[PDB]
Design a protein around this ligand. Structure first.
Ligand SMILES: [Ca+2]
Lengths: 903, 221, 214, 642
């Protein structure tokens, strides 16, 4: 038209990001008034809204700082607000609103508003027909323009509406996108739940695993399928069963007091309690400033203990008594372990060691006792008279081995007193019934690196149930023998047999102290203290899992380590394939397989919460008028509270103001004054507010609609119901005078749908020979047949016309041979103008875009570019009128058969 | 087609009143607005005022506020300028133009204009012109017409009902010491065209109903 | 208030030349400016709107540009038909205003006048007054000296002139000089002469008639 | 005889500088000092650097500046608390103290471009890396994006070296993904227990065309108010113009996690000129609950829900306003700004903090001590009123009940709260004290604060006090320590202390003196005081228009943006469509949110004072230890008491 901007010259607004300006800028120019200043030139985006700009600044000296948000409002006097949903289902008709605004103060605007045509969408906008309304928007006000469209192609898709205003150089357009999606929904599912633990039925040949694929035979076509693995690390890793509680050892801090042996009885639980708490870092809970007072009980025990130091560097009960062999060795063990805690004298420790090697050793190296203690309960399992030259050789030796890191050059022939003592016990290691003498000798051996073979086996197998070195009778000797053994197992670096031994000690909870517990205390809290040191810091969880997918070219040998704080991964498959998943060595972990697909629908999509029924019919006696009737009820025998009916007019129709006010005055029904006070022509959307609706009956209402503007085609109307508290669970029906279910003419079967709003076949005056030969050679034309209609088969959705092929004037992609049959397809509404009759012959040609089907699901669509035309019978041709035609067909067939198209 | 037409211009006594009208056609009056601009003899354009026909909203140049007024009949797509307390310095040609809104935020250009009407604010009396032949003096022969002693402006001279437009020169009027205007309209024609062609000059003076068609030819003597 | 200033008030230039009239604002006015052209005795015409958008119909040689405080109309290849005055109009600010305007004059080669003389009408004599006209047709430049000799006696103070507005096609001016005596005075003297002085004439051209006799 | 002392913070932090104050009282000539720091238990030296000599020149007071590396025996060993051993060696005399070490390195703040996101879009985020001074560091951070149910999905490891402490990162949200509250979790490599979070919502949505605001006339509901709860609904387009439409409002009670709705209260008001009013009647509320005791509603809250639908039907939005407290009094009394200890014989200045039920400071609110009338001071802009109670030398605790006394209220509506103040016990019952007094007016870096030192010691030995040693704690560390000198007979002296930006957000002034007199006793007397400062930026940052403002730009248009920051400072930016915040406004980075974090990480716990000198140091987050045996208690707690 004249005096308005043309659609082609309008460039639609497009840039509508939710966030932008993700930029960095350094302030460089000099500080006037101690404040730098940068001028930034930004390009505002297309969104008509208010932006909020947030600046955070970082400085070396003044640090971090966060500005107050700064608003910017972008605005126009006239614009379109295209209200698109987040997504829409494919082949599902939907209505969208374009809202036009006129913020001019004293001036109506006459606008032409237009929906552009997009192949992805079936609408009244078509290839050769625009869809344009003309509306008048009052000042300081807006106007809804509805558009019914059916998305046909999946994925991210685009809608464009534009608008020019007459009599002004003013235009607008909005180009937004929406996600078109299939049906179904998302399904998590696991295939395997394994445990990657070698040396536990994974065996010596490093656990080799196999995990087959997913089934996925109920799947809906043309979607993704992402597998997801969960490679966990459920950790008892750091093989460290929780240490003994710190609150239980409160009775161990004993103030040492007595003679020469009673002083060493009291000093035992205190010194070992410190050695324990030092490594386990449990000084927080027990009492931190108590260590400075508990160290002074050991310094009090040490300073008192040197008062019983005889001239020859030896120890005993009193100074008057002859010296004991074992007691001087135990003093070296407690002093060697307490070198780190208190100030020991150099003359004292190695001095007690010099006396032992020179004075107390026999030909073969049995450190025999010379003065048995009065308090014999202190020496523990040695108190038993059975084999007290085998254990007694090992005990004194252990004191030498722990004190060897310090005493080297002073005690000259120390290497030698260790080798010969290690001969006597090693040789006679196979002559020990009791588990005590087996174990106490076993720790002495392992410190040197001489515990191998049958002597290393007898050590392992003496343990009853593979954990504890028990003996018949008193159970304090049982706990002592095993703790010596745990010190042996820690030195060997055999982390296979370590866990079961300590696990039993944790289920004993022997807190020491009491009476006759000297050795059971010193050894259990030393062995479980040395355990926290040498027990693996990071253990392992060392699986080399190599996943080989036959879709993929290469393996993916994923490493696993207890160190990375994740312990989880995930791949992303594209095709459902069977793959190997081979583990390797140590640790533990989960191993799931979760694909994700879309299934078929099941018949309860649509209107889950409401029933909606809408009809439009002609009026009674009295230009064009009709009776819209809306019938709705909720779902569940329990009236819904407060609902909305959002109605939209068929183009050119408007509601009867009289019938509306009649409705609004009715109880349980409300229509805003704003809607009622509006003009007749400027009112094509409507909201009727209901107070309730149940599933007892059906709540029904109806009202007159009058056609004021006259137009061709005319877009269906729409009624949408929902409760106020939930828009998402809605239900919409459409209405139209000549379509019912106001559905736009589409052509659906199986997956996809053709927009069928176009003309049925190529229309019709001349039908020249020179006409047919042009249009039969138009670009797309991929076939021209002579066909006999074998069997006509009708339906409501689409009529299946079966054609027999007489001759193939032109062959194309479909390699049909003469005599064979091909199925032609046409919508419900084309049958009227087609008149396809059985055993009547036909001349048909059409495009490659008309092939619906895979192969041999081949069908022929009789679309707008398809040409069909009647061919009188061979003997029927001989007749006055229709001789003109019959000849031109045969004349056309020979031009086509002989010369074909010039292309 | 969009087109605008002013009318009602003429002579007024100082202090007096006058109502110009502007006939809009070819567009919806209600969706647009109309401006009155004026031009003093041989000087710049001065915008006078808007009207928004939709709801009758006005704006006025200070030079006119309290004196001038714009109204509209929306059914007859006409706008009106009612002038009161007219001064000497209000003498001008008065145009009406359509305001079209190009930008955003209410900027407008004026894309269609009427032809304008001349309003002249003087004590003087309406006087019709005396029209005299300017005879050609026996290859190109000039002839013309003298339009003498008239007031106020304007006069419109044309030749043979506007058939002859080629090489005509209707000169500016000139204010005689008497107070009345006189101008010449001259037209050069090929001297051969005399005798055969007829030459009538078509003076028309709206303010005094004076219409004259004078023939101009050589003499007998 | 918002102060606008158009420069230059007037400019001369030759056919095919680059012309540039400018408009300047006291504060920022964004894109709210339009340019108009007005031929003599005619309604103005829109050329440019929104600073730079060329109004439909207007030739491509017309071109607008500018933003904020400085705007320029530009005629790139001047033409004879572009004899006009040009105005700059702002719609920023609540009352619009046209500015003072730039008168654009065409510059062409020297063309001498065709001089003509018309004696008083016999009808005009009946009124008791004699008007004798002298027509200097289609000449460049404007500068001209017309002198009336009555029986060779020269006389000031009893004649008036009217210069035509520069022609849109050939960029020339016509002129009419009118001498006014009383019927009585006119019937006294005999030889009436109009004398034309101009740059395109080698020497002053004189046109005349002897009263009564043909 | 000479006394050597050390002061350090109660908690020492890794990699950052922590200062140690060194003093030599009754000293003679130059005295060298070695400051050592060892691990605990057992000693392998970690920083024995920093040797210094406090000289007569500087009144025998100096300091040492040291830093702790995150070495081998601290990194892996965590779970149970770590300690070190600070040790000063003044000439020959050794003084030591064990101090709890925190593994907290500094601070991480996480900005996300939006607060909400759809499937398929990209989440943009920056991580700001600073130390305990809120100054940028160049460390190595570990980052974890985490789905709604706590499963990591993307993980990163980068360093902000040569970075100005700004780490730009992103993550493409996959299409078929879970819907809910996702998290970003960043922590310093060295401090896996100190994890910083930020939530972002994922959801399928489209930006609305307008916002809706729901405001009640009062910020609470007084249960005997029979007018009910009066709400106003405002709708407004994002661009500014007012909205026309219909509003459905509903009310509901919330007891903790539970949320009763009140269907009887549902209304359908018109929205005209972007405005509408609705009321919750008292009957509908009380007939909505099964407990007849109006009074059983006190402590529970009310929430309003508003749903505005435009007249076109083209769009609708939902807003709500929750946590409207049901109350018996319009006010709320807090003792969180008052010291819990007093000095017997001196007036106890009880700092009453009155607030409205939402937490905001009250104003012009009378408060009286129960028993006395008019003993009041209408609360000021800060929300605090001062009530100064006289005390006797008795060591009986002060039990104080405060009441508001707002005139037009009735007795039942007056707010009331009680407290107990414990006495500062003197050493050997010397009855010698130090009282610091400071005035309460919001401080800004530029103005100056008078600090008053009142020497409350009996005449016979006062001439021995020749200085007070004062220390200033800010941002959880030692900001400054100095000396306010004193001369015999000066019972009160004022230190003119100047405020700088280093004093933001707040600070504690701890001071003390020492002597012998009341017996042959090395006596120590101390006091502390907490003082709040205006929580502005250290520097400044402001964004505004250079675009000759007053115009309103248009889509596509250029504009100029003025940034007013600190010289040589980096500045990062974002622009968000405010429609985003109609849907979600949680987890927005703010300057007050940075300070809130900082002040919650203070090692000082008390508003001031203490139960004794050791208590004063400890409560303000300071160790004290001396060669003569006097020291603060052991602090093994990384968190404040409760
Ligand atoms: Ca503060």
């Amino acid at each position: 038209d004249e005096d308005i901007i043309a659609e082609e010259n309008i460039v639609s607004r497009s840039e509508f990001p939710e966030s932008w300006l993700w930029n960095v800028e350094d302030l460089k120019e000099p500080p006037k008034n101690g404040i730098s200043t940068k001028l930034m030139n930004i390009f505002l985006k297309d969104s008509i809204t208010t932006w909020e700009i947030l600046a955070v600044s970082m400085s070396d000296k003044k640090g971090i700082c966060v500005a107050d948000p700064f608003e910017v409002t972008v605005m126009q006097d006239f614009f379109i607000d295209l209200r698109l949903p987040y997504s829409v289902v494919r082949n599902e008709q939907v209505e969208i609103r374009a809202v036009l605004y006129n913020y001019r103060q004293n001036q109506e605007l006459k606008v032409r508003v237009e929906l552009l045509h997009n192949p992805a969408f079936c609408s009244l906008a078509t290839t050769k027909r625009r869809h344009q309304q003309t509306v008048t928007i009052p000042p300081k006000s807006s106007l809804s323009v509805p558009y019914v469209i059916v998305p046909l192609k999946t994925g991210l898709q685009e809608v464009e509406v534009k608008a020019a205003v007459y009599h002004h150089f003013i235009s607008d357009g909005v180009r937004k996108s929406l996600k078109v999606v299939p049906e179904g929904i998302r399904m998590n599912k696991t295939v395997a739940v394994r445990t990657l633990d070698p040396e536990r039925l994974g065996r010596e040949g490093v656990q080799k695993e196999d995990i087959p694929p997913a089934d996925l035979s109920d799947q809906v076509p043309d979607t993704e399928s992402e597998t997801r693995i969960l490679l966990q690390g459920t950790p008892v890793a750091q093989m460290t069963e929780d240490a003994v509680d710190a609150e239980r050892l409160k009775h161990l801090i004993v103030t040492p007091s007595g003679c020469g042996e009673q002083n060493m009885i009291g000093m035992t639980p205190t010194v070992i309690a410190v050695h324990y708490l030092d490594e386990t870092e449990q000084w927080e809970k027990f009492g931190l400033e108590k260590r400075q007072g508990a160290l002074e009980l050991i310094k009090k025990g040490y300073t008192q203990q040197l008062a019983f130091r005889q001239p020859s560097s030896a120890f005993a009960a009193f100074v008057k008594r002859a010296p004991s062999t074992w007691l001087t060795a135990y003093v070296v063990k407690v002093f060697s372990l307490a070198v780190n805690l208190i100030a020991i004298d150099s003359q004292v420790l190695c001095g007690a060691v010099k006396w032992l090697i020179l004075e107390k050793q026999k030909p073969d190296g049995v450190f025999q006792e010379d003065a048995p203690v009065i308090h014999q309960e202190m020496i523990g399992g040695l108190r038993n008279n059975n084999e007290k030259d085998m254990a007694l050789t090992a005990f004194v030796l252990i004191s030498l081995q722990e004190a060897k890191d310090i005493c080297e050059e002073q005690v000259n022939s120390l290497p030698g007193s260790i080798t010969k003592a290690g001969d006597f016990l090693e040789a006679n290691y196979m002559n020990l019934q009791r588990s005590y003498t087996v174990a106490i000798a076993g720790y002495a051996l392992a410190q040197m690196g001489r515990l191998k073979g049958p002597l290393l086996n007898k050590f392992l197998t003496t343990a009853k149930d593979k954990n504890r070195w028990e003996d018949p009778g008193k159970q304090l000797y049982n706990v002592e023998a095993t703790s010596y053994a745990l010190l042996a197992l820690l030195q060997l670096k055999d982390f296979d047999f370590v866990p079961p031994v300590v696990r039993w000690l944790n289920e004993q909870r022997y807190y020491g102290g009491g009476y006759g517990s000297t050795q059971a205390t010193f050894m259990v809290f030393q062995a479980l203290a040395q355990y926290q040191k040498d027990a693996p810091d990071h253990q392992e969880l060392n699986l080399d899992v190599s996943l080989q997918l036959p879709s993929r070219s290469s393996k993916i040998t994923h490493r696993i380590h207890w160190e990375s704080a994740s312990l989880l991964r995930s791949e992303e498959t594209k095709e459902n394939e069977g793959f190997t998943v081979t583990a390797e060595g140590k640790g533990q972990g989960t191993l799931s397989v979760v694909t994700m697909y879309h299934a078929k629908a099941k018949d309860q999509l649509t209107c889950n919460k409401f029933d909606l029924k809408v009809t439009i019919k002609p009026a009674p006696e009295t230009k064009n008028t009709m009776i819209l009737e809306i019938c709705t009820r909720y779902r569940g025998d329990q009236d819904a509270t407060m609902s909305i009916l959002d109605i939209s007019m068929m183009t050119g129709f408007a509601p009867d103001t009289d019938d509306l006010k009649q409705l609004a005055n009715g109880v349980d029904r409300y229509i805003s004054k704003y809607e009622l006070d509006k003009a007749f022509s400027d009112r094509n959307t409507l909201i009727i507010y209901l107070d309730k609706v149940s599933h007892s009956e059906d709540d029904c209402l109806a009202f007159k609609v009058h056609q004021y503007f006259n137009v061709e085609l005319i877009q269906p109307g729409a009624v949408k119901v929902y409760a106020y508290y939930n828009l998402e669970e809605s239900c919409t029906r459409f209405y139209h005078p000549e379509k019912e279910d106001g559905k736009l003419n589409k052509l659906c079967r199986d997956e996809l749908c053709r927009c069928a709003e176009e003309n049925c076949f190529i229309q019709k005056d001349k039908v020249t020979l020179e006409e047919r030969l042009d249009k039969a050679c138009e670009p797309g034309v991929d076939y021209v047949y002579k066909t006999r209609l074998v069997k006509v088969q009708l339906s409501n959705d689409f009529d299946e016309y079966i054609m027999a092929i007489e001759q193939t004037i032109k062959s194309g992609s479909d390699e049909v041979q003469v005599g064979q049959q091909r199925t032609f397809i046409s919508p419900i509404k084309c049958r009227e103008a087609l008149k396809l009759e059985e055993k009547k012959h036909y001349l048909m040609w059409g495009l490659s875009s008309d092939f619906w089907g895979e192969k041999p699901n081949l069908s022929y669509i009789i679309g707008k570019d398809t040409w069909v035309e009647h061919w009188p019978e061979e003997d029927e041709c001989q007749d006055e009128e229709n001789q003109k035609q019959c000849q031109d067909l045969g004349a056309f067939t020979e031009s086509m058969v002989v010369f074909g198209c010039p292309n | 087609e969009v087109q605008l037409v002013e009318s009602g211009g003429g002579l007024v006594q100082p202090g007096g009143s006058l109502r110009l009208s502007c006939a809009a056609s070819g567009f919806s009056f209600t969706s647009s607005s109309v401006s009155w601009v004026r031009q003093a003899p041989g000087k710049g354009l001065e915008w006078v005022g808007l009207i928004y026909p939709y709801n009758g909203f006005n704006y006025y140049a200070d030079s006119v506020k309290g004196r001038f007024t714009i109204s509209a009949n929306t059914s007859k797509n006409t706008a009106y300028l009612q002038m009161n307390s007219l001064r000497a310095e209000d003498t001008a040609v008065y145009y009406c133009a359509r305001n079209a809104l190009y930008g955003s935020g209410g900027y407008y250009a004026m894309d269609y204009w009427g032809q304008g009407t001349l309003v002249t604010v003087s004590s003087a009396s309406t006087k019709g012109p005396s029209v005299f032949p300017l005879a050609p003096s026996s290859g190109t022969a000039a002839l013309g017409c003298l339009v003498k002693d008239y007031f106020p402006e304007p006069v419109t001279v044309s030749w043979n009902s506007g058939a002859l437009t080629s090489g005509v020169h209707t000169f500016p009027a000139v204010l005689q010491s008497s107070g009345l205007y006189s101008l010449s309209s001259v037209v050069t024609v090929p001297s051969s065209s005399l005798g055969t062609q007829t030459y009538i000059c078509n003076v028309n003076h709206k303010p005094s109903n004076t219409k004259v068609d004078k023939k101009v030819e050589p003499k007998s003597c | 208030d918002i102060q606008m200033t158009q420069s230059p008030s007037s400019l001369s230039a030759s056919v095919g030349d680059r012309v540039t009239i400018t408009c300047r604002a006291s504060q920022d006015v964004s894109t709210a400016v339009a340019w108009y052209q007005q031929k003599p005795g005619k309604a103005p015409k829109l050329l440019i709107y929104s600073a730079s958008f060329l109004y439909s119909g207007v030739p491509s040689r017309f071109s607008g540009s500018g933003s904020g405080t400085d705007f320029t109309l530009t005629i790139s290849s001047l033409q004879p038909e572009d004899f006009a005055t040009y105005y700059c109009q702002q719609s920023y600010a609540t009352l619009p205003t046209f500015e003072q305007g730039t008168k654009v004059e065409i510059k062409r080669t020297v063309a001498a006048p065709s001089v003509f003389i018309f004696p008083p009408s016999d009808e005009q004599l009946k009124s008791g007054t004699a008007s004798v006209v002298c027509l200097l047709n289609n000449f460049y430049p404007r500068e001209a000296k017309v002198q009336w000799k009555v029986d060779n006696a020269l006389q000031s103070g009893n004649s008036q002139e009217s210069v035509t507005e520069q022609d849109s096609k050939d960029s020339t001016y016509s002129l009419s000089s009118t001498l006014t005596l009383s019927k009585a005075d006119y019937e006294k003297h005999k030889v009436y002469a109009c004398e034309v002085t101009h740059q395109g004439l080698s020497s002053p051209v004189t046109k005349s008639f002897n009263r009564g006799e043909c | 005889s000479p006394m050597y002392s050390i002061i350090t913070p109660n908690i020492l932090r890794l990699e950052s500088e922590e200062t140690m104050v060194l003093e030599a009282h009754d000293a003679q000539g130059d005295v060298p000092v070695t400051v050592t720091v060892h691990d605990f238990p057992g000693k392998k030296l970690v920083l024995s650097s920093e040797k210094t000599v406090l000289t007569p020149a500087t009144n025998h007071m100096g300091n040492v500046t040291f830093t702790i590396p995150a070495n081998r025996e601290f990194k892996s060993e965590k779970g149970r608390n770590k300690f070190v051993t600070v040790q000063a060696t003044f000439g020959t005399q050794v003084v030591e103290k064990v101090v709890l070490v925190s593994l907290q390195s500094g601070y991480l703040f996480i900005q996300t471009d939006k607060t909400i996101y759809t499937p398929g879009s990209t989440v943009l985020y920056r991580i700001f890396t600073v130390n305990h001074k809120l100054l940028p560091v160049g460390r190595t951070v570990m980052v974890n994006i985490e789905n709604p149910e706590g499963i990591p999905v993307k993980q990163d490891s980068l360093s902000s070296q040569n970075q100005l402490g700004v780490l730009p990162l992103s993550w493409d949200i996959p299409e078929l993904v879970n819907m809910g509250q996702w998290k970003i979790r960043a922590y310093y490599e060295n401090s896996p227990q100190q994890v910083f979070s930020t939530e972002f919502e994922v959801k399928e949505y489209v930006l609305p065309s307008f916002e809706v605001i729901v405001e009640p006339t009062e910020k609470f509901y007084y249960i005997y108010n029979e007018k009910g709860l009066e709400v106003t609904i405002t709708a407004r387009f994002l661009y500014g113009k007012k909205v026309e439409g219909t509003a459905f409002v509903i009310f509901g009670i919330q007891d903790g996690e539970q949320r009763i709705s009140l269907p009887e209260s549902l209304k359908r008001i018109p929205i005209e000129d972007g405005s509408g009013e609705v009321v919750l009647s008292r009957k509908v509320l009380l007939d909505g609950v099964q407990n007849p005791r109006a009074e059983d509603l006190v402590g529970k809250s009310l929430y309003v829900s508003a749903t505005v639908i435009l007249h076109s039907g083209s769009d609708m939005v939902q807003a709500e306003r929750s946590g409207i407290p049901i109350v018996t009094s319009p006010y709320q009394i807090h003792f969180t700004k008052t010291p819990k200890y007093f000095k017997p014989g001196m007036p106890f200045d009880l700092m009453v903090f009155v607030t409205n039920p939402d937490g905001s400071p009250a104003y012009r609110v009378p408060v009286a001590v129960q028993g006395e009338d008019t003993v009041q001071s209408l609360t000021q802009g800060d929300g605090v009123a001062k009530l100064s109670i006289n005390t006797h030398p008795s060591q009986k605790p002060l039990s104080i009940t405060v009441r508001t006394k707002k005139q037009e209220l009735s007795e039942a509506e007056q707010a009331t709260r009680t407290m107990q103040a414990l006495p500062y016990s003197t050493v050997g019952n010397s009855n010698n004290y130090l009282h610091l007094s400071v005035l309460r007016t919001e401080l800004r870096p530029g103005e100056t604060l008078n600090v008053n030192f009142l020497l409350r010691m009996d005449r016979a030995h006062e001439a021995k006090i020749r200085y007070y040693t004062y220390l200033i704690m800010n941002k959880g560390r030692l900001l400054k320590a100095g000396r306010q000198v004193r001369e015999p007979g000066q019972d009160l002296v004022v230190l003119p202390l100047s405020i700088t930006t280093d004093f933001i957000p707040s600070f504690r002034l701890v001071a003390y003196y020492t002597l012998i007199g009341a017996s042959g006793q090395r006596e120590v007397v101390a006091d502390s005081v907490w003082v709040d400062v205006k929580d502005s930026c250290v520097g400044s940052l402001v964004v505004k228009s250079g675009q000759s403002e007053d115009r309103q730009p248009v889509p596509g248009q250029q504009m100029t943006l003025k940034i007013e920051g600190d010289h040589g400072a980096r500045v990062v930016l974002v622009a968000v469509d405010k429609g985003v915040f109609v849907l979600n406004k949680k987890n927005k980075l703010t300057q007050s949110k940075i300070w809130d974090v900082v002040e919650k990480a203070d090692i000082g716990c008390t508003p001031g004072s203490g139960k004794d000198y050791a208590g004063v140091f400890s409560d303000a987050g300071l160790t004290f230890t001396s060669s003569s045996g006097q020291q603060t208690a052991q602090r093994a707690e990384l968190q404040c008491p409760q």
